[PDB]
Amino acid sequence: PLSETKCTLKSFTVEKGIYQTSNFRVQPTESIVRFPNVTNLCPFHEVFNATRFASVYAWNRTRISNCVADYSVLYNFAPFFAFKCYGVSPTKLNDLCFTN
Amino acid sequence: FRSSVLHLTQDLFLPFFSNVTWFHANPVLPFNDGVYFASTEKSNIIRGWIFGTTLDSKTQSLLIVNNATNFVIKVCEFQFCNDPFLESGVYSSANNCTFEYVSQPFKNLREFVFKNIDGYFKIYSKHTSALEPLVDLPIGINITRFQTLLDYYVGYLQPRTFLLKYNENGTITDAVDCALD
Amino acid sequence: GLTGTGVLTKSNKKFLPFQQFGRDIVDTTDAVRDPQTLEILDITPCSFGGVSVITPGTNTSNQVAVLYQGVNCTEVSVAIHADQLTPTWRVYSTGSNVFQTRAGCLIGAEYVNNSYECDIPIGAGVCASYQTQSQSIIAYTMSLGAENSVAYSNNSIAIPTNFTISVTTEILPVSMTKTSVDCTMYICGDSTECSNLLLQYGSFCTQLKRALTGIAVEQDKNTQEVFAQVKQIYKTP
Amino acid sequence: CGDSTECSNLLLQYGSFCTQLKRALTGIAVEQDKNTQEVFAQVKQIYKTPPIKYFGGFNFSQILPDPSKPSKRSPIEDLLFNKVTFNGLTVLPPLLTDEMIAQYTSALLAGTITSGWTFGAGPALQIPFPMQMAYRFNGIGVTQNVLYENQKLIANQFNSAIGKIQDSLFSTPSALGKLQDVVNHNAQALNTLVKQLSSKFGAISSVLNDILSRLDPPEAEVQIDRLITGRLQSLQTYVTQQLIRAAEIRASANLAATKMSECVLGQSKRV
Amino acid sequence: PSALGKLQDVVNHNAQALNTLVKQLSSKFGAISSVLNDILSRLDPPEAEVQIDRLITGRLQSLQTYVTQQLIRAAEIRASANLAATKMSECVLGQSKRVDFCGKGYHLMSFPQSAPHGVVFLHVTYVPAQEKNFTTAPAICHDGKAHFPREGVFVSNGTHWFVTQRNFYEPQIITTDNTFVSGNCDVVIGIVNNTVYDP
Amino acid sequence: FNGLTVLPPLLTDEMIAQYTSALLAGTITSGWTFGAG
């Protein structure tokens, strides 16, 4: 601290007394995130666990809203699916928010 | 949740000592930035309200039904024949019904305050004072008029400034307006 | 979405079933709610303050002392043990001389039970000095003087028999220097394009010049009303 | 800025205003201690009262310290003490505690009741209180025999007038509003300064923890500059107001120091 | 050497203010450069008016701050000069009776001395010393009448009684020229009996 | 510098010394009579 006092006074000599130099702060240790929890609701596996998968000539459109998009229900089933996307990345999609 | 402090709030409130309209126990009533509703009739028959802009099954309207067992909300283009009455006793047809909700089930006063701002729809209520929020609706319909179905009162809100007082427990005790004196 | 930093402890606040967070008079967040447990937790800011250095003079010694203003040493010990303190220099840590005052914690000196005259004011009636005790730095409580008891009675009186002549000094300032500013060479400086832009700001230069002229005029009357009290010049025989 | 590194680099270009602010605050802090030093430290000896208290009929029990209560103060001092009630802001404790001021006051009272005016212009002598009042009676044009003839009446009147002061200062709570106004003015400025942080000066948000941690694009330098200027102006205004009030505080302290020397340590003839 | 620091602090402050004011010129307030002679002679595009406006505002603020500080110091110096002018008129051109105003003790005379941006006073005071204890009495009775001292106080060395002044020990014989009669010997509390001389 | 000028005082040090000498002479030769007539 003597060198800090010399730098604050900009001199090599210093008389007797008390001098303020800087401040002290306690730094954080770890991070904590507190978000919504297990109480959720999203039916999304209904368009995967069926038999009549909307025959090509009579394809059916199903809007899915008011849900929490969790792309982990396909791994619980057979992993024989292929996650081929166009224009969107499967990694930056997990942290997005869509309407319909 | 303030604690023992006086906060100055500027929002849409009901001005003190205003002109209210008294009815008995049905024309179209305008919806000007919220409508105040109150009823103290024991064994009330009037149960439900209608919100919309054309009310002829051409635009997404709002309809709610209240009873002593639950509270359901159905938002769609309900077609009315001549007048609502209180089951297909209030509407006749339905089309493009993609949104539906439901609420939690559970002298005497019964107050209600409606508001539609920023694409949200919230309603306050209290039974016997301050009104607490009950349920918010993320629906983005364009409400223009107001209509009821069956001794109720109708009042309009205005952007006035008020001073609220909070006690230790965090409840509103008194309020003071900023006009008329 | 609510971000911040602090210490989370349990409080006795009783929130309402539709409240999420709490604010105080100065509108700062001090209480939140857990979306998982629904409990009452209070937020307190982490420790901070200033640092002061006490030195007896570079020509006498090279030993100093550190003072942490407004903090308990129990937290300072934890912040020194774990690398969580902002000042990276920790030289006064391996010492059994730690004292707690009402203005903070002092590290680098020892407290004595004797009273002396205050030399370097620390705070809360505590001063420090540099005595030979092996010379070191000591801390003590400042004294007000020496106790004197007057012999009061019903028929007692004191009359002096001798006297003395004393001479004292006193220094008082009278005036100061005089300065003038152009406001043109200082702002733009030998520039024509910048000078055309200053004309839009008004007459601040006029006010500055008037204030400086008034100060310069007052500095002369200050001396005139002090040294010109006589009208004639007297000479000694 | 507040716990921020990007905003701290933009502040280094504005110069050394922080140094001037700290110097002004340190000067004010030193002046606030020297004001009390030049008022309550005019004596060098600590005089004490004798065990027996008989001064010819004058009762000073309401102004002398009471050894029963832990706080070594007089009942009037106790009444006066009982009737008078962040993010970079720190309050510094005073140098002299209340007990030292009480000891100074007790020493002044002892030197006044035991010596009178001799301890202020040299060594302290001893003189009885009636003979001391007889000499003060001559300082206004009244002969000394009036006191020797009406000592009992004068003592009764003095004891009644001293007792009336407690009732006069106990039923009126607004008698010491001058000291409360200073505390109120000092407390309101800090609250205003801490409230000024929740305002915007041409930016998208007012709170500091809303844009200093969420703004993605680096083009927010012009937005941070507005907040920097707005928060520097408030500090400058606060320092200016403090420097303005310091002059009135110094003037009041000088007037009090002059009165302490001209009314307590002697008898004045100024009307 | 540090006895005259009051006059040195003013010079130090006045020198530091100008140094800070001239140092403020080498700073940028949101521009591409800090020095004035770097953009005022090299800016090719004429759309840099805001770059000069920022510096103009930043320098005007410093000028206003300097002027405010000088205005405050001027009032402080005016108060000090008024106090000095009052002291020069009260302690030098006469003998004052104000306690602790023209020195510590009984003031006699003062001498002024010229100093750079100041003035020095040399106060001459009177301080007693070598006090002794005696026995005093309020008054005396001779023929049933109370005799009060005109100027002084009644003292006794143990056997005899004398009268002297309160500022110097000089015993004198109590005569009718030093006392006056007022009242009887039954009203004074703590009175003593003695003899009064009548030439 | 860059527009900073220091103005000299009106009275020189010799005039202040003469005033001080006149005050001292009037004090040592008259006392308190030279200030009231």
Swiss-Prot record, chain A:
Disulfide bridges in this chain: 42-67
Sugar attachment sites: 29, 31, 37, 49
Region: Disordered, residue numbers: 25-41
Function: Attaches the virion to the cell membrane by interacting with host receptor, initiating the infection. The major receptor is host ACE2. When S2/S2' has been cleaved, binding to the receptor triggers direct fusion at the cell membrane. When S2/S2' has not been cleaved, binding to the receptor results in internalization of the virus by endocytosis using host TFRC and GRM2 and leading to fusion of the virion membrane with the host endosomal membrane. Alternatively, may use NRP1/NRP2 and integrin as entry receptors.
Subunit structure: Binds to host ACE2. RBD also interacts with the N-linked glycan on 'Asn-90' of ACE2. Cleavage of S generates a polybasic C-terminal sequence on S1 that binds to host Neuropilin-1 (NRP1) and Neuropilin-2 (NRP2) receptors. Interacts with host integrin alpha-5/beta-1 (ITGA5:ITGB1) and with ACE2 in complex with integrin alpha-5/beta-1 (ITGA5:ITGB1). May interact via cytoplasmic c-terminus with M protein. May interact (via N-terminus) with host bilirubin and biliverdin, thereby preventing antibody binding to the SARS-CoV-2 spike NTD via an allosteric mechanism.
Protein name: Spike protein S1
Protein species of origin: Severe acute respiratory syndrome coronavirus 2
Taxon lineage: Viruses, Riboviria, Orthornavirae, Pisuviricota, Pisoniviricetes
Part of the whole protein covered: 295 to 394 of 1273
UniProtKB/Swiss-Prot annotation, chain B:
Annotated consequence of substituting residue 130 to V: In strain: 20A.EU1
Residue ranges of domain BetaCoV S1-NTD in the record: 1-181
Outcome after substituting residue 40 to I: In strain: Iota/B.1.526, Mu/B.1.621, B.1.1.318, Omicron/BA.1
Result when mutating residue 10 to H: In strain: Omicron/EG.5.1
Annotated spans, Putative superantigen: 167-181
Cystine crosslinks: 76-97
Outcome, altering residue 25 to V: In strain: Eta/B.1.525, Omicron/BA.1
Effect of residue 66 to Q: Partial loss of biliverdin affinity
Glycosylation, residue list: 19, 67, 96, 142, 169
Effect noted on mutating residue 142 to Q: Increased resistance to neutralizing antibodies
Quaternary structure, from the entry: Binds to host ACE2. RBD also interacts with the N-linked glycan on 'Asn-90' of ACE2. Cleavage of S generates a polybasic C-terminal sequence on S1 that binds to host Neuropilin-1 (NRP1) and Neuropilin-2 (NRP2) receptors. Interacts with host integrin alpha-5/beta-1 (ITGA5:ITGB1) and with ACE2 in complex with integrin alpha-5/beta-1 (ITGA5:ITGB1). May interact via cytoplasmic c-terminus with M protein. May interact (via N-terminus) with host bilirubin and biliverdin, thereby preventing antibody binding to the SARS-CoV-2 spike NTD via an allosteric mechanism.
Function: Attaches the virion to the cell membrane by interacting with host receptor, initiating the infection. The major receptor is host ACE2. When S2/S2' has been cleaved, binding to the receptor triggers direct fusion at the cell membrane. When S2/S2' has not been cleaved, binding to the receptor results in internalization of the virus by endocytosis using host TFRC and GRM2 and leading to fusion of the virion membrane with the host endosomal membrane. Alternatively, may use NRP1/NRP2 and integrin as entry receptors.
Identification of the protein by name: Spike protein S1
Organism name: Severe acute respiratory syndrome coronavirus 2
Parent-protein start and end of this portion: 43 to 294 of 1273
From Swiss-Prot, chain D:
Residue span of region Heptad repeat 1: 151-201
Glycan attachment residues as annotated in the record: 59
Mutagenesis or variant effect for residue 90 to N: In strain: Lambda/C.37
Coiled-coil features, chain-numbered ranges: 180-224
Site entry (Cleavage), positions: 73-74
Cystine pairings recorded for this chain: 1-7
Chain's role: Precursor of the fusion protein processed in the biosynthesis of the S protein and the formation of virus particle. Mediates fusion of the virion and cellular membranes by functioning as a class I viral fusion protein. Contains two viral fusion peptides that are unmasked after cleavage. The S2/S2' cleavage occurs during virus entry at the cell membrane by host TMPRSS2 or during endocytosis by host CSTL.
Protein name per Swiss-Prot or TrEMBL: Spike protein S2
Organism: Severe acute respiratory syndrome coronavirus 2 (2019-nCoV)
Lineage: Viruses, Riboviria, Orthornavirae, Pisuviricota, Pisoniviricetes
